[PDB]
């Protein structure tokens, strides 16, 4: 159901912030193949990280990036015991943040 474009990044909460920011930033800068926009997705406890990444990209862009967020609920499924089968089902809050190039002011 969720999108899996090269544009869509589900951010890991565990990684170093500074490096993660720099990877996102490189997506927006290119090498070219620059993305005019990316989508930063944060699931559960990774919501603050997604926000922090987006707002920092915005802040360092000299007015050339803007951000906009939406929310949803995501269903995560995984097996505990094989098949009769015992499957763990979790609902998580999520945030979905568009980070896009604009004309400054």
């Amino acid at each position: 159901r969720l999108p899996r474009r090269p544009n869509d990044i589900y951010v890991n909460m565990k990684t170093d912030f500074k490096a993660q920011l720099a990877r996102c930033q490189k997506l927006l800068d290119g090498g070219q193949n620059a993305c005019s926009e990316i989508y930063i997705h944060g699931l559960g406890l990774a919501i603050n990280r997604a926000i922090n990444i987006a707002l920092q990209l915005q802040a360092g862009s000299f007015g050339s990036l803007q951000v906009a967020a939406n929310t949803s609920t995501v269903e995560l499924v995984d097996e505990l015991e094989p098949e009769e089968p015992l499957t763990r089902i979790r609902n998580n809050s999520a945030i979905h943040i568009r980070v896009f190039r604009v004309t400054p002011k």
């Binding site: 919501i47 603050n48 707002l55 803007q66 949803s72 609920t73 809050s93 943040i97």
Partner: protein, 121 residues
């Protein structure tokens, strides 16, 4: 005292619920659903930061399931936290991510940043 709330520009009459780490969802939602059950209440806001950001989103998402047809705007922001340091007194401030979410019965401008339309039942 601290100014007008979030969304005072869009829905000044909305009830604002601050979501904190100490907040209890079922209890917070009980009040929110009762509030929004009334016809006089047209909208509600949930806000929070840091260790309550995820919980704030969950509260919004629960209400959207209990009342279908709500228009949503999400706004991102930072909020300060005081840290006292003496390690290698001294008050030091840092920004912590957060958000505020508006949910309303009445139509909102769909072109504004952070807008999300009502989910189909």
């Amino acid at each position: 005292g601290p100014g007008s709330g979030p969304f005072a520009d869009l829905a000044p009459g909305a009830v604002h619920m601050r979501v904190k780490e100490g907040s209890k969802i079922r209890n917070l939602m009980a009040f929110a659903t009762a509030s929004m059950a009334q016809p006089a209440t047209r909208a509600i806001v949930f806000s929070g930061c840091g260790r309550a950001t995820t919980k704030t989103v969950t509260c919004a998402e629960i209400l959207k399931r209990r009342l279908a047809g709500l228009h949503q705007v999400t706004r991102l922001r930072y909020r300060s936290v005081r840290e006292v340091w003496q390690s290698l007194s001294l008050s030091v401030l840092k920004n912590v991510p957060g958000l505020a979410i508006l949910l309303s019965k009445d139509a909102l401008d769909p072109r504004q940043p952070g807008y999300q339309p009502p989910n189909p039942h």
